[PDB]
Design a protein around this nucleic acid. Structure first.
Ligand code: MG
Ligand code: MG
Ligand code: MG
Ligand code: MG
Ligand code: MG
Ligand code: MG
Ligand code: MG
Ligand code: MG
Ligand code: MG
Ligand code: MG
Ligand code: MG
Ligand code: MG
Ligand code: MG
Ligand code: MG
Ligand code: MG
Ligand code: MG
Ligand code: ZN
Ligand code: ZN
Ligand code: ZN
Lengths: 232, 135, 81, 104, 91, 97
RNA sequence: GGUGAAAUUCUUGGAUUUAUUGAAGACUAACAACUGCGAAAGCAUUCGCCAAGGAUGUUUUCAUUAAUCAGGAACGAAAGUUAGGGGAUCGAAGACGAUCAGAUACCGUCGUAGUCUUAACCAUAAACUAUGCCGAUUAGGGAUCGGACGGCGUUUAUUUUUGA
């Protein structure tokens, strides 16, 4: 509302002179790492480089949310969005690397339903490359076609047995791996198939998934690895 | 003035519309929160405080958002819906749909519907007391 | 119903009720002779044994205790004596 | 006099239950006593489906769903016309109401 | 043959300094004159010498502890947590 | 190692043992001991001295997991004890392990 | 910002909003039910350690060892008290903005004790199933949690027996 301001600019002020800050902006391209199919993911904006304020420093700590469906050109993985962290900005060419993964919220509420049992676990792990990262997991009980009984509930003893089997399998699989190998296992959801094959005997546990992955620490920049993954 | 690109391809942005039960905010960025393309709210456009959250006010705000972002070169938007969250209502306000429709009708492109309402895993005690608002 | 001879219930009805709810209590457990594959000896084992029973020769296990009646080794056969 | 066999709470066999907050007036009520409603709805109302469909950039698109679980105290239950007064004989009937499947 | 109703050891102060102050001093004084079992030899002869020094009358060992007690809950919890942290981290 | 508490009681009731340090040392000198027990909080010099004699005599030694107070009360006696020797087993099977 | 509607309050000394990072305390949504455990009060994030308990199974063991209790004793929500630590959020007392003829209230912005924990007191609640404890008999039905027993099949694995 126009007629509510009382102090306006405050105790004492004066109008501005120069406006329209968009005359000094620049547009940059964004790339993607090696395993993904498409590399261009959009455009980004930043102020033009000037004295006392370099542009490259402002484009080294940005994060981006990109759905995995766009990266893989496939509508099956339309419920996962991942984070990408910018590291080095080549001329008119931003280079990026992995920064995380996460499911969409709406699918998780569509999975959560009454009168069944949900199994959940998490675990921290470190790779051969000195990355400290944490994993989340999800599973649900499976209905049987000929059941007449209304409810499907599991006993806590098997619940903890499943939790132990999940933790041991995930730790064994993620014990000795690199980022390129693990992501090459993430996009086809390899981990789930071993979880289900190991656990069918105790109880079915349909909808095995890795909820999210987040990293805590990183080693030195190691530009050689970034240039190894980029520019194919 | 704008990013050079061929006519066939189109560039993406993201709009974060916050629709509570007292006011609505429309904010457009560039697929990241570092840069804000434009922002307008119901309050300046409307002439009465109560009407700031009306669907009509949200549609009017969406029209001049599309007008302001058209010359920047951006041609398509993703939307990120969020409610009050936390201890709030978690139900989007009345001016959500209005502005969303006005954005679609103005000619803009739409993709990647999403809801970003913040939900706690286990929240603190909520305002009001043991007897609630007794009116 | 309304006319039954309670003195002489049917054998199925007395083999079907709980072991203490019959006219006179009677155990529903038994002894058995097990054929050990390795040797030719004979051991008498309770059907509901609470302890692991060891055979005299070659020292092999015969059963594992459980909540009800002990479970026998897979490569074994028995007859109820 | 007893008006209801279950004391209008549905709690027999235990001593205490953790309370919850009403979604309207922020009152505290036992979880088993509050009225719980589960709702599934669309992102946009049915008239806007075409506008989203032809304004999308993915040819055919399927709008996602929205899932909420609201919970009210009894004071908020019959003021919002969620539930209504029944007769003395009709009180003892816990079958869900038959939703209309023809709509004339 | 109890000679007191509730005052206890702090009866040497007569009718001075107030009941609350006598109760507070008595509660802390009672634990300072008692005897504690030695952790090394096992005999029940360990007594306070200085403000933070306790010594055993049998094996003649002397140990530094709290003001009025051989050990403090904070120090015990810190020794236990440090032992747990070290053994998990290095083993 | 909870079983050893019950196992020792049978040896006490059936066989014959000698308690204390001087008597165990004299038995170990005699060379007719079969197993020696040592408490947790005995002085380290005493520990190594006893182990050195056991090593010379080729007899097993067991390190009890508790102090001498419960070592003493684990034998039905009302006094502390730090070390002991098994002169002979009774009907028990201590020497099996 | 918030309301049936306003104002108190914060704002180009850049409010509100957007993205990244850090710190602090409290709490464990959805799953969660005419479902579980405990003498009751009460008990919901993972894992490790310690002792305890009910039910089932049993051709193990003792042999009346038992039922209720005047006085007596242990426990006993919330609030409250005495000494330390901690103090994010709400919020008794209190200070403002509105409504009203008045409003020391209901509505809105702040806010002390308290809300958490350690060592000790207090012993009262619509502490309700408004229904004392032990023992025997009395009508039909279908659900459901734990243990044991019988059976036709399906699923599945270094696969049988087990688990569903
Ligand atoms: Mg408003
Ligand atoms: Mg009213
Ligand atoms: Mg009960
Ligand atoms: Mg109660
Ligand atoms: Mg700002
Ligand atoms: Mg939980
Ligand atoms: Mg349960
Ligand atoms: Mg009495
Ligand atoms: Mg209390
Ligand atoms: Mg204090
Ligand atoms: Mg108030
Ligand atoms: Mg406040
Ligand atoms: Mg308190
Ligand atoms: Mg009373
Ligand atoms: Mg009673
Ligand atoms: Mg069976
Ligand atoms: Zn044999
Ligand atoms: Zn309410
Ligand atoms: Zn000593």
């Amino acid at each position: 509302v126009g007629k509510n301001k009382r102090l306006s600019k405050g105790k004492k002020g004066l109008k501005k002179k120069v406006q329209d800050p968009f005359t000094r902006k620049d547009w940059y391209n964004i790339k993607a790492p090696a395993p993904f199919a498409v590399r261009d993911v959009g455009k980004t904006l930043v102020n033009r480089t000037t004295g006392l304020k370099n542009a490259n420093d402002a484009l080294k700590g940005r994060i981006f949310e990109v759905c995995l469906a766009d990266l893989q050109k496939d509508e099956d993985h339309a419920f996962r969005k991942i984070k990408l962290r910018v590291d080095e900005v080549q001329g008119k060419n931003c280079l990026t690397n992995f920064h995380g993964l996460d499911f969409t919220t709406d699918k998780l509420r569509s999975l959560v339903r009454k009168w069944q049992t949900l199994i959940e676990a998490n675990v921290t792990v470190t790779t051969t490359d000195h990355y400290l990262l944490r994993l989340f997991a999800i599973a649900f009980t499976k209905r049987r076609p000929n059941q007449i009984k209304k409810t499907t509930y599991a006993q806590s003893s098997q619940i903890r047995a499943i939790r132990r089997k999940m933790v041991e399998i995930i730790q064994r699989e993620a014990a000795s791996c690199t980022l390129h190998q693990l992501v090459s296992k993430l996009i086809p959801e390899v981990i789930g198939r071993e979880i289900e094959k190991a656990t069918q005997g105790i109880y079915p546990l349909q909808n095995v998934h890795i909820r999210k992955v987040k990293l805590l620490k990183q080693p030195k920049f190691d530009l050689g690895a970034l240039m190894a993954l980029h520019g194919e | 003035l704008g990013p050079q690109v061929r006519e066939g391809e189109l560039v993406f942005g993201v709009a974060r519309i916050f629709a509570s039960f007292n006011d609505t905010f429309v904010h457009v960025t560039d697929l990241s929160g570092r840069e804000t393309i434009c922002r307008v709210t119901g309050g300046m456009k409307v002439k009465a405080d109560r009407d700031e959250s009306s669907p009509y006010a949200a549609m009017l705000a969406a029209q001049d958002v599309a007008a302001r972002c058209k010359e920047l070169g951006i041609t398509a938007l993703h939307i990120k819906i969020r409610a009050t969250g936390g201890n709030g209502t978690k139900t989007p306000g009345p001016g959500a749909q209005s502005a969303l429709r006005a954005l679609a009708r103005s000619g803009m492109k739409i993709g990647r519907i999403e809801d970003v309402t913040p939900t706690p895993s286990d929240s603190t005690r909520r305002k009001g007391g043991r007897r609630g608002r007794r009116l | 119903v309304l006319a039954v001879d309670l003195l002489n219930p049917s054998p199925a009805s007395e083999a079907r009720k709980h072991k203490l709810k019959t006219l006179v209590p009677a155990p529903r457990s038994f002894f058995m002779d097990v054929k050990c594959p390795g040797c030719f000896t004979i051991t008498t084992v309770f059907s509901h044994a609470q302890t692991v029973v060891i055979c005299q020769g070659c020292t092999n296990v015969l059963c594992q205790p459980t909540g009800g009646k002990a479970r026998l080794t897979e490569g074994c056969s028995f007859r109820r004596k | 006099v007893k008006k209801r066999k279950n004391n209008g709470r549905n709690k027999k066999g235990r001593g205490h239950v953790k309370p919850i907050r009403c979604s309207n007036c922020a009152r505290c009520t036992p979880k088993d006593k509050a009225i719980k409603r589960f709702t599934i709805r669309n992102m946009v109302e049915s008239a806007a489906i075409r506008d989203i469909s032809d304004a999308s950039v993915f040819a055919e698109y399927t709008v996602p769903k929205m899932y909420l679980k609201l919970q009210y105290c009894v004071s908020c239950a019959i003021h919002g016309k969620i539930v209504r007064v029944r007769s003395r004989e009709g009180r003892r009937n816990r079958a869900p109401p038959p939703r209309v499947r023809y709509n004339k | 043959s109890k000679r007191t109703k509730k005052v206890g050891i702090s009866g040497k102060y007569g009718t001075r300094y107030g009941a609350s102050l006598r109760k507070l001093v008595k509660k802390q004084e009672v634990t300072q004159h008692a005897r504690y079992t030695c952790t090394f030899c096992g005999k029940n002869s360990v007594r306070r010498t200085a403000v933070g020094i306790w010594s055993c009358k049998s094996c003649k060992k002397t140990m530094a502890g709290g003001a009025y007690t051989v050990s403090t809950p904070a120090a015990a919890a810190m020794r236990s947590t440090l032992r747990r942290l070290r053994e998990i981290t290095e083993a | 190692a909870q079983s050893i508490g019950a196992k020792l009681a049978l040896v006490i009731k059936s066989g014959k043992v000698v308690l204390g340090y001087r008597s165990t040392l004299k038995a170990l000198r005699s060379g007719k001991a079969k197993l020696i027990l040592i408490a947790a909080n005995t002085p380290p010099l005493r520990k190594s001295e006893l182990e050195y004699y056991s090593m010379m005599s080729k007899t097993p030694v067991h390190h009890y997991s508790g102090t001498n107070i419960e070592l003493g009360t684990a034998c039905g006696k009302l006094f502390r004890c730090s070390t002991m020797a098994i002169l002979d087993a009774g009907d028990s099977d201590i020497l099996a392990d």
